[PDB]
Write a protein that binds this DNA or RNA. Structure first.
Ligand SMILES: [Zn+2]
Ligand SMILES: [Zn+2]
Ligand SMILES: [Zn+2]
Ligand SMILES: [Zn+2]
Lengths: 72, 73
DNA sequence: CGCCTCCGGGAGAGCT
DNA sequence: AGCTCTCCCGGAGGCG
């Protein structure tokens, strides 16, 4: 019942991966159109409920790493 | 207490443009997509309510259409 | 028919 | 503005 991107409470399988609603819509938005997203740390930011908003680059990386994809 | 505009049963929200109950939503989608041709056994003016709605899909469909229901809404 | 679960996705409200 | 994230409602696939 835990999101594989941020460990918040998961709402189901979204875009192929067990995720929360937050990460589901974050990903849909990130994966379409152009976004810079630059990490301010060392591309290993902590992405949990409290901090996931801080680094969209690291959050997006984790989405991809977990296997999220539009085709699913 | 929100009432389906087609059959007066308890509405479940705004479906296809119109405040309807779940059964009317489901019925409407099926009616439009099976291109169903229904025939009224009366005078094209049946009472459509929770029990009677089953009797006359012709009149139920007509009412759905007259209320503004549309799949693209 | 009337209902169910599951998931995509728009609206919009509220941040920053 | 851009972004976040929950309220609704859509289809698909299924069941009694
Ligand atoms: Zn998450
Ligand atoms: Zn980062
Ligand atoms: Zn109804
Ligand atoms: Zn009739």
């Amino acid at each position: 019942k835990l999101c594989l991107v941020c460990s918040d409470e998961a709402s189901g399988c979204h875009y192929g991966v067990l995720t929360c609603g937050s990460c589901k819509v974050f990903f849909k938005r990130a994966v379409e159109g152009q976004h810079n997203y630059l990490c301010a740390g060392r591309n290993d930011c902590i992405i949990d409920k409290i901090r996931r908003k801080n680094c969209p680059a690291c959050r997006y990386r984790k989405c991809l790493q977990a296997g999220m994809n539009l085709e699913a």
